[PDB]
């Protein structure tokens, strides 16, 4: 039987069977409850909605993310995300196919038990494994060594993967991500008189962030051009038909990834946390890493971000180290892609925790690993 690969991302849950090069399900990881009374009883209305149903029904729902920053906040909400993943998004019984869960490095040890216990005891998976996300990303990028800069909706993660291993001592969890970046767009929009407050309204802003915003190669030069001429100004109209007129805001938002100061964040910026990670390595592998900078996760998509990242990290490194940025298309999904490859290996097909192994050992199976 084929394996199921699941990516427990902060923003969108990417899922599908192994060997496939694109996920079969991709949806916003939202549990949306009623904001108001369901007066037309003939609707057959639901105690909560999820994914694209919640996003269609946006205007009448309180949208809660079960993962914030990077940790599960309410297990039953996450459990609903998983239930919906199997029965509705994929239309499969989870008792019937092996399952892979993605996980973040340095997530506290108890989370591994909760995930494992839910997957065997709520969902009856016939076999299971739990994988460090970032590894899958490089793996998908083909290369057997490099530094990952993975950033989704919740965590920016930097990992130097060497000889195919994560080096745990070098892992720089950064709490700046897509969601945080969304907030700052709200403010810079506010400057020009546009307002957005409700959690529904947050998701509208997310749509804008994914379209008009881009990374300028040098900040004040661009901004001086924009302050001179309205040529840099574009528009995008809300569901209520009114256009928003936007210039200076377009580069200003994702500038924050290079300047966490803009948001008062004490942690370093995206190039910085990458360098700051590189330097921690066994010195011999420094040049092995610099040629092998690998970007991934949804926040890595902004136009000009790779060129900026190059000019930026070039300052931090000693020169002539040949720093190169791996940033082709499809990097929206490298993490899930990697799992799909991993789950195709015959050796991995031996290596899963089996249902029978958990049914004898319980959650204690992880205590050999977690120290």
């Amino acid at each position: 039987i084929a394996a199921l690969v699941v990516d427990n991302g902060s923003g969108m849950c990417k899922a599908g069977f192994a060997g496939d090069d694109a996920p079969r399900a991709v949806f916003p990881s939202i549990v949306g409850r009623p904001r108001h009374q369901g007066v037309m009883v003939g609707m057959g209305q639901k105690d909560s909605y999820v994914g694209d149903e919640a996003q269609s029904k946006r205007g009448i729902l309180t949208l809660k993310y079960p993962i914030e920053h990077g940790i599960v906040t309410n297990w039953d909400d996450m459990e609903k995300i998983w239930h919906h993943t199997f029965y509705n998004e994929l239309r499969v019984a989870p008792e019937e196919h092996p399952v892979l869960l993605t996980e973040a490095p340095l997530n506290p040890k108890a989370n591994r038990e909760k995930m494992t216990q839910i997957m065997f005891e709520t969902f009856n998976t016939p076999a299971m494994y739990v994988a460090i996300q970032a590894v899958l990303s490089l793996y998908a990028s083909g290369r057997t060594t490099g530094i990952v800069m993975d950033s989704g909706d919740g965590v920016t993660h930097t990992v130097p993967i060497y000889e195919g291993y994560a080096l745990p001592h070098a892992i720089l969890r950064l709490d700046l991500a897509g969601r945080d970046l969304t907030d700052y767009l709200m403010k810079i929009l506010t400057e020009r008189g546009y307002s957005f407050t409700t959690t529904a309204e947050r998701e509208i802003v997310r749509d804008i962030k994914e379209k008009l915003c881009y990374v300028a190669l040098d900040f004040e030069q661009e901004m001086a051009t924009a302050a001179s001429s309205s040529s840099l100004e574009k528009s995008y109209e809300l569901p209520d038909g009114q256009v928003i007129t936007i210039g200076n805001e377009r580069f200003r938002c994702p500038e924050a990834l290079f300047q966490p100061s803009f948001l008062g964040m004490e942690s370093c910026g995206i190039h910085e946390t990458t360098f700051n990670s590189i330097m921690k390595c066994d010195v011999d592998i420094r040049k092995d890493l610099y040629a092998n900078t690998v970007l991934s996760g949804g926040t890595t998509m902004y136009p000009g971000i790779a060129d900026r990242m190059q000019k930026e990290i070039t300052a931090l490194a000693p020169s002539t180290m040949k720093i190169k940025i791996i940033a082709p298309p499809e990097r929206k999904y490298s993490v899930w892609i990697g799992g799909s490859i991993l789950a195709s290996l015959s050796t991995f097909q031996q290596m899963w925790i089996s249902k029978q192994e958990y049914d004898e050992s319980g959650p204690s199976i992880v205590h050999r690993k977690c120290f």
Binding site: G193, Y194, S195, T197, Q242, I244
Partner: peptide, 7 residues
């Protein structure tokens, strides 16, 4: 309604 796109 005050707001340019919101109230």
């Amino acid at each position: 309604p005050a707001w340019x796109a919101x109230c």
